[PDB]
């Protein structure tokens, strides 16, 4: 019977993805079936041109999908949502797409943010979704054109537990066949914290300096790890664990270079740890 799988958002994430995921199931005779959720003039190129486009540096490809649609309930149930929408609060994406949810169904948010499985699992089984991010410079840049500006990728996902779970490996043997660089970790919070961490300090630094992070480094380097120690003791304060060397793991790896800012006062107010350049950052530049 046919793998199954949706994706909800064709931006560049889940454009990007979903176009790989469909060029295979276009190789394979009916052992895979790729959705889309897309919509507007997005959509309608897309249906115009039969597919979605990619241009990367060294490719250039049109993948064509099983089925594209605005209407999640033309799809009907999937083994796999792979949600790709910035565009809705938690409550109504995870009402849209409940018409693709069954027995089977596995969902992974590849979205930026610390907790988003966590939010999504509020409604949901905690086995029904589970964790992911994504490495990738992608971006919808015309109706139906996904540009990347460059080809390298890292798509991690996990269910959390100690042991891979059959639709796991099931999933991560089918995404490297589609040759995606997947990778199923069991610390897979270590990622999305990781992954987290380096985006909200980079965003909130750029963001209240004005300035590229490389004139960061330079000239603002007390307050740039004033920022990593900060989301670092934060981290290892609601998670209880989180490495060492962690600080200077993100310290170097800026060097060869709006609720990742917010996210980050809110839980230190509740595990009472004081912030103090987070919440000069916040605070002073949401005015």
Sequence with gaps: QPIKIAVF???????????????????????????????????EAIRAAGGLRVVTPSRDFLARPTCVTDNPAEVGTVDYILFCTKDYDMERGVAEIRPMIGQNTKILPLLNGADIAERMRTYLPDTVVWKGCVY??????????????????????????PEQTDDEVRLAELLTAAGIRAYNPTDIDWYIMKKFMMISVTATATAYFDKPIGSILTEHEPELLSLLEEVAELFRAKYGQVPDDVVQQLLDKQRKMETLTGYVVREAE??????????RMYRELVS
Excluded: C, N, Q
């Design 9 to 43: 958002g064709l931006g560049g994430v889940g454009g990007y993805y979903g176009a790989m995921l469909a060029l295979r199931a276009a190789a394979t005779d009916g052992l895979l079936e790729v959705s889309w959720i897309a919509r507007g003039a997005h959509l």
């Design 136 to 161: 990738i410079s992608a971006r919808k840049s015309a109706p139906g054109l996904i540009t990347l500006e460059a080809d390298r990728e890292l798509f991690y996902f996990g269910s959390g537990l």
């Design 270 to 279: 509740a595990l009472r740890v004081d912030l103090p350049m987070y919440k």
